[PDB]
Design a protein around this ligand. Structure first.
Ligand SMILES: [Cl-]
Length: 245
């Protein structure tokens, strides 16, 4: 009785960060995307790592492409979150503003989670124009900063902000986009039209129809569910698969 034993294992509802605690952090690609030869980034990246043919192929949604300027976190993180999102969507804004920072702090910054953005424009012309602007920011390595500036500007909006070019230019300046002539041209011209069509067709082929939508490891989540739900799923998925080889 004059001894201390190690903590008992508890049911997961009382176990706190057990998946995290036992997972192997990634060590590669923590410093951002790999640039192209000219120091710009491949803003035409979209899609899965490999075709999905059945439910058995669910992990294929996660690209783990070191060149991807739409991704944050270790390319060898044990868990990937694949997100399908729309820049006019208030549920997408709420996830970005209220859930993502917690996931950055608890998981991404520790090498445990990589988050990959995928365009799924549902809100019409403003959403397509915003996605084109996002790809123009990503070409200059500023996707994350652009996304945060735009969604923080939507933090009090219950509907759609109806952003247009001058809004996107402000978010790009806020984000530190260095070549504003290239940004403004690519935000408007045909550069990203093909890839946005292909991204939408890819999401529709998975049956993903509503934003935001997520594949957290092997688990699909529809909508801006509570932060605690994302944490529980992350912990569960890290328990199932603690290491990426
Ligand atoms: Cl596919």
């Amino acid at each position: 009785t004059q001894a201390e034993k190690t903590a008992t294992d508890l049911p997961p509802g009382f176990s706190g960060k057990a998946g995290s605690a036992n997972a192997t952090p990634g060590t590669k690609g923590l410093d951002g995307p790999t640039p192209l030869a000219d120091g710009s980034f491949d803003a035409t990246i979209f899609g899965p790592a490999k075709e999905l043919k059945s439910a058995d192929d669910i992990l294929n949604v996660h690209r783990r492409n070191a060149k991807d300027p739409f991704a944050v976190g270790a390319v060898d993180a044990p868990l990937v979150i694949t997100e399908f999102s729309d820049f006019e969507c208030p549920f997408c804004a709420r996830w970005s503003n209220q859930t993502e920072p917690t996931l950055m702090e608890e998981y991404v910054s520790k090498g445990l989670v990589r988050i990959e953005w995928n365009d799924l424009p549902v809100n019409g012309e403003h959403a397509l124009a915003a996605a084109k602007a996002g790809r123009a920011a990503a070409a200059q390595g500023k996707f994350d900063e652009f996304r945060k500036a735009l969604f923080e500007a939507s933090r009090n909006v219950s509907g759609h902000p109806n952003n247009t070019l001058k809004d996107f230019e402000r978010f790009a300046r806020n984000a530190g986009v260095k070549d504003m002539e290239r940004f403004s041209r690519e935000a408007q011209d045909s550069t990203y039209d093909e890839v946005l069509t292909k991204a939408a067709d890819y999401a529709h082929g998975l049956g993903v129809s509503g934003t935001p939508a997520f594949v957290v490891g092997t688990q699909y989540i529809s909508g801006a569910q509570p932060t605690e739900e994302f944490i529980k799923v992350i912990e569960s998925e890290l328990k199932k698969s603690p290491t990426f080889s």
